[PDB]
Amino acid sequence: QQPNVEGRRFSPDQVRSVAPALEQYTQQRLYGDVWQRPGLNRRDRSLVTIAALIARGEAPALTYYADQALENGVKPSEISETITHLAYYSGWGKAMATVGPVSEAFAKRGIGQDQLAAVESTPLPLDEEAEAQRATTVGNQFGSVAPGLVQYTTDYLFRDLWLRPDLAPRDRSLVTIAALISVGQVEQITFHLNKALDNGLSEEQAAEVITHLAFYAGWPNAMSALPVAKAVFEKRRG
Amino acid sequence: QQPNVEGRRFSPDQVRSVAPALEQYTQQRLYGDVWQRPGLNRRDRSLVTIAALIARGEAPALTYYADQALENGVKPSEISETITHLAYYSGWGKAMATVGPVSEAFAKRGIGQDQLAAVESTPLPLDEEAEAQRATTVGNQFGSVAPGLVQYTTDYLFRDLWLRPDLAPRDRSLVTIAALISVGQVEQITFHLNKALDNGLSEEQAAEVITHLAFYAGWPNAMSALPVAKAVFEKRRG
Amino acid sequence: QQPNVEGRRFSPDQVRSVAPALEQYTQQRLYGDVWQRPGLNRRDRSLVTIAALIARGEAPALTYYADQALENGVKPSEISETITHLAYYSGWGKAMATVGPVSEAFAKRGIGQDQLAAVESTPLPLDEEAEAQRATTVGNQFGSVAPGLVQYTTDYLFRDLWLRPDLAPRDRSLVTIAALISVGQVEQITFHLNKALDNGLSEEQAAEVITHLAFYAGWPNAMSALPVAKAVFEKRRG
Numbered sequence: 001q002q003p004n005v006e007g008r009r010f011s012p013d014q015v016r017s018v019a020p021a022l023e024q025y026t027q028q029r030l031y032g033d034v035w036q037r038p039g040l041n042r043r044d045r046s047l048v049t050i051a052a053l054i055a056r057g058e059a060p061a062l063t064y065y066a067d068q069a070l071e072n073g074v075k076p077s078e079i080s081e082t083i084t085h086l087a088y089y090s091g092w093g094k095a096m097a098t099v100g101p102v103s104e105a106f107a108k109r110g111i112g113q114d115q116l117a118a119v120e121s122t123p124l125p126l127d128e129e130a131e132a133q134r135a136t137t138v139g140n141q142f143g144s145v146a147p148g149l150v151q152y153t154t155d156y157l158f159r160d161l162w163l164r165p166d167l168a169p170r171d172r173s174l175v176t177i178a179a180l181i182s183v184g185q186v187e188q189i190t191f192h193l194n195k196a197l198d199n200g201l202s203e204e205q206a207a208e209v210i211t212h213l214a215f216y217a218g219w220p221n222a223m224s225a226l227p228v229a230k231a232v233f234e235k236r237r238g
Numbered sequence: 239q240q241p242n243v244e245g246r247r248f249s250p251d252q253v254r255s256v257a258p259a260l261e262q263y264t265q266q267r268l269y270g271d272v273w274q275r276p277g278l279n280r281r282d283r284s285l286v287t288i289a290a291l292i293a294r295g296e297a298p299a300l301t302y303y304a305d306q307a308l309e310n311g312v313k314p315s316e317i318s319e320t321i322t323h324l325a326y327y328s329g330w331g332k333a334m335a336t337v338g339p340v341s342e343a344f345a346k347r348g349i350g351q352d353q354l355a356a357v358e359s360t361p362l363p364l365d366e367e368a369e370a371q372r373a374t375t376v377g378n379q380f381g382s383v384a385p386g387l388v389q390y391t392t393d394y395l396f397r398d399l400w401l402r403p404d405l406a407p408r409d410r411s412l413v414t415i416a417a418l419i420s421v422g423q424v425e426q427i428t429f430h431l432n433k434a435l436d437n438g439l440s441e442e443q444a445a446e447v448i449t450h451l452a453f454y455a456g457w458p459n460a461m462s463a464l465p466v467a468k469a470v471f472e473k474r475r476g
Numbered sequence: 477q478q479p480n481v482e483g484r485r486f487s488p489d490q491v492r493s494v495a496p497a498l499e500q501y502t503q504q505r506l507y508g509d510v511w512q513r514p515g516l517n518r519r520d521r522s523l524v525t526i527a528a529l530i531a532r533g534e535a536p537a538l539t540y541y542a543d544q545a546l547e548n549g550v551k552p553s554e555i556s557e558t559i560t561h562l563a564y565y566s567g568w569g570k571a572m573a574t575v576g577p578v579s580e581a582f583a584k585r586g587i588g589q590d591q592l593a594a595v596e597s598t599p600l601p602l603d604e605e606a607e608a609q610r611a612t613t614v615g616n617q618f619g620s621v622a623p624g625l626v627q628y629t630t631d632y633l634f635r636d637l638w639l640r641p642d643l644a645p646r647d648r649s650l651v652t653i654a655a656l657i658s659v660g661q662v663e664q665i666t667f668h669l670n671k672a673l674d675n676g677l678s679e680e681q682a683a684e685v686i687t688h689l690a691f692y693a694g695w696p697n698a699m700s701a702l703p704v705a706k707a708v709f710e711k712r713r714g
Contacts (some may be wrong), residue, residue, distance in 0.1 A: 119497045294533070
């Protein structure tokens with residue numbers, strides 16, 4: 001039920017040499033059920049999975065998963081941009097680790113540099129009022145605690161990274177929430193889940209993201225996200 | 239004082255080329271003292287260590303540590319089942335990473351597939367009342383937040399994984415608490431430590447688990463577990 | 477703007493084959509701006525970076541970063557001691573992972589074992605009253621919860637590791653706060669940041685540490701440290 005078995009790091013035979021139950025579960029549950037849940041499509045699941053693997057330092061799995069993402073209709077430029085985005089959100093080393101595995105995936109598919117996310121291009125429109133509010137809140141709270149970090153947050157992230165067009169805002173928020181959930185960073189989920197929902201991700205899609213990540217990032221990480229998600233959904237109803 | 243020095247990823251000579259104090263501490267403190275603490279036996283320490291290495295993405299160390307576990311009397315089927323269990327609790331990629339290192343450990347010992355945990359076998363008895371209570375609690379709290387995840391929790395975990403006989407309930411709880419502590423997932427320790435104690439793990443054994451993990455998962459992770467453990471021990475006395 | 481381009485795991489060409497924007501950001505922002513911020517010098521930034529890479533299981537990057545640290549004036553003995561220190565604070569496996577990459581860095585520079593941190597040497601002076609207070613607090617709270625861990629905390633850490641002269645107290649605290657921030661261990665930052673400030677790290681230096689780590693350990697980790705740092709700074713003013 002899993003596509004492109006030959007592209008896997010470890011073969012079904014190899015997995016069965018240690019844990020045949022795991023191989024069966026991979027086929028019947030992970031690929032046969034989770035990946036088949038229609039509330040979130042294969043393209044979006046690929047973005048969520050790539051984000052999880054990057055955030056969790058499981059870059060070797062990316063050769064297979066990046067190839068699958070391309071097959072599922074994720075653009076090379078979107079994979080490219082996910083890596084750049086997660087340099088900031090997961091850390092530079094986590095992004096750098098992707099270079100070998102993803103370059104291999106691209107090379108096999110004949111994906112040249114001309115298909116990648118632009119170094120510099122026309123920014124998306126900035127909601128100036130919401131940004132003025134965001135900057136004021138952070139500056140008032142932490143401006144004298146870490147002035148450099150506060151300034152970088154504004155200049156590098158909210159006035160640049162988040163306006164880069166190579167991921168649609170919805171998709172950039174999607175990869176962000178996936179990366180956060182994947183490493184249990186529940187403190188930052190409220191802001192970014194609200195942003196994702198504002199950007200067009202549906203509540204059921206968000207529930208599917210959490211559900212998908214139970215498998216890729218472990219049950220406790222998915223479980224920890226639930227009260228945060230619940231609070232967000234309830235607050236939007238007020 | 240450390241057994242099977244030749245089976246290590248890095249030799250004592252190699253460790254001494256960077257940090258001779260670390261090599262000395264490994265011999266005198268880790269192997270000479272911690273591993274020798276009689277409150278928790280070598281077999282259980284091996285299970286705790288394997289769980290920690292899996293959860294923390296330190297799979298390369300597993301060739302040595304899985305071999306040691308087998309020497310310490312952990313069954314191949316128990317190692318097999320730990321991997322499958324932690325696919326769910328640590329994440330699929332963390333379990334998958336074990337395949338290469340553990341297959342090598344098994345191959346060297348002539349451990350064939352006939353010795354592994356069963357794909358499907360007769361489930362252990364389910365405490366139907368405690369399960370009805372568990373399902374009701376979760377369903378009431380998060381049923382409309384992530385219905386898919388709630389259903390999978392019931393169907394995949396509590397009505398299947400936890401009833402698989404290839405780990406005794408005590409040992410399955412042992413590996414779970416070890417994996418949780420190892421990545422600082424304190425939110426889920428209350429439930430699983432209670433379950434471990436219910437399943438027959440002693441309070442002193444649990445204290446030894448936390449102590450062992452200070453070395454393998456870092457002091458802060460062990461320290462973070464202490465107030466949770468304290469609260470559990472005190473609550474059971476009420 | 478990045479020194480020793482040829483020593484990198486992945487070349488600029490390789491990074492550009494996946495994410496040319498990331499390569500540009502590395503040059504212009506990470507190396508061209510962050511590393512150039514004068515509030516924290518290159519030597520201290522190297523210690524912070526090594527600690528982050530060790531804590532986050534990004535040991536492969538260490539060949540380049542350890543070489544850079546040596547170029548920046550970090551002593552071989554200080555790198556040696558950072559590894560030993562983080563065996564305790566990040567975990568044994570995280571320290572062990574450094575052996576290959578750092579040994580390579582040392583070999584290329586002709587750094588022999590005679591330049592490494594001493595296995596045993598004359599301890600630094602212990603503040604006996606502050607230690608009596610620390611031991612009493614921990615013993616009263618957790619002495620009967622995990623007696624072994626409480627005893628090891630005293631004997632292995634505060635009456636040995638922290639008195640080892642191969643890192644100055646300021647630098648040992650620096651590597652500790654870096655390692656904690658890098659994996660989001662906010663629970664332990666209050667104690668260790670106070671200790672760092674007591675040991676001579678300035679508040680602006682601490683702010684630069686957090687800022688540097690936003691890039692190496694991801695924005696959310698740096699952001700999570702801010703309220704802890706704020707509370708510490710404010711408390712010292714009372």
